[PDB]
Structure 1
């Protein structure tokens, strides 16, 4: 890729596209990746995570599956923490737990609770692409959720087109093009080959 071309399109995004459209949605863009001749029905399917320390989406609907020594910190931080009786209630009714799975965009689970999750609601929630990230022994809920979030899951599916939405207009241009450069470098590294393997890169906005 050319860094001059990246500057051309992010200048064309902000603020030429802002002047053309005057977007009334949440101002964000997405990157769409097309590739020529990689058969999705074959082997070496790829599924990786991209560590992005920028948090492109601030409105990040977050909840935790917390054990003890997390109730007071989550209540102070405005984080919904549910005890073991609540997951039992959320296991009794399966329609309600699916609805809030659509509502809440990420699940954070502890070590012991992820061992208790595959009883009956494990495979039931596993059929959504809703893998919960496990916590570490540091037990510092501050800035670990920020590091756990904004981790883009580059997952291969059976369709020959793939899109990821990152980057807002409220942040500086130098940081977002660093996010774009880090994303396409991890995408190339996760692929079976280098930059030849991709065919087209569209970094246009949603609107």
Structure 2
């Protein structure tokens, strides 16, 4: 199955996880998938986009904020999940710099129905410009589970260049989780392209500060 074999993927994962000529580092390293596309003209072709949920959390330092109402804020307070009340947002005067900094601080935002419908009036066109617009959180949902779900999603988007890169795992992984994650990501990506494998030229799996390994 696939033009990337299990043997090849296992070999690359072994190379990036535990292999000679490596270099131990203080901070936990993140493995990332690098893609090079071909036979694509971004000025004329469709610009694909998609989000896919992996089985294991790629980045265990993902930060999620809950732009929630009073009930959710009380619910969040029982957990270390950060939150901001409507009053805190209103304190901002829709200033560009402050909303930009708020978007930069966290990686994903979560919001309740009562608040998602108010963002343009309270925050302005700042969170969409940064590519971070809140998801909907319902009182019929477990907060921890939803926070986990946003922590396991990756996004494929094409803007102007034929270079793509996403995070698929960290180096403290069992070497079988990472292969599963890479398989999921690659299959999804091929699903998003017009011609399945006639639009993919090269694939690489690499640790943060590590040696590249070629899959395709």
Q: TM-score, normalised by structure 2?
A: 0.88
Q: How many residues align?
A: 206
- Residue in structure 2 matched with residue 11 of structure 1 by the alignment: 14
Match of 1:22 among 17, 21, 24: 24
Question: Which residue is 2:185 aligned to?
Answer: 183
Pick which of 27-36 and 66-75 moved more. 66-75
Residue 176 of structure 2 aligns to a residue in which SS?
helix
The reply to whether residue 171 of structure 1 matches residue 177 of structure 2 is no
Asked whether the 8 Å contact 1:51–1:150 carries over to 2, the reply is yes
Does residue 115 in structure 1 map to residue 147 in structure 2? no
Alignment equivalent of 2:5, drawn from 2, 6, 19? 2
1:179 CA displacement = 0.5
> Which residue does 1:87 correspond to in 2?
89
Query: How far 1:137 moved relative to its partner?
Result: 5.0
Contact residue 67 and residue 110 of structure 1 kept, 8 A: yes
Report how far residue 136 of structure 1 moved: 3.6
Where do 5+ consecutive residues of structure 2 fail to align? 210-216
- Partners of 1:72 and 1:137 in 2: CA distance: 12
More helix by share: 1
Q: In 1, Cα distance between the equivalents of 2:203 and 2:129?
A: 30
Aligned counterparts, 1:1-207, within 5 A:
1-16=4-19, 19-119=21-121, 121-207=123-209
Cα distance between partner residues in 2 of 1:152 and 1:172:
20
C-alpha deviation, 1:25, in angstroms: 3.6
- Cα pair 2:108 2:150 within 8 Å, conserved: no
Separation in 1, partners of 2:198, 2:139:
41
> Quick one: distance in 2 between partners of 1:200 and 1:151?
23
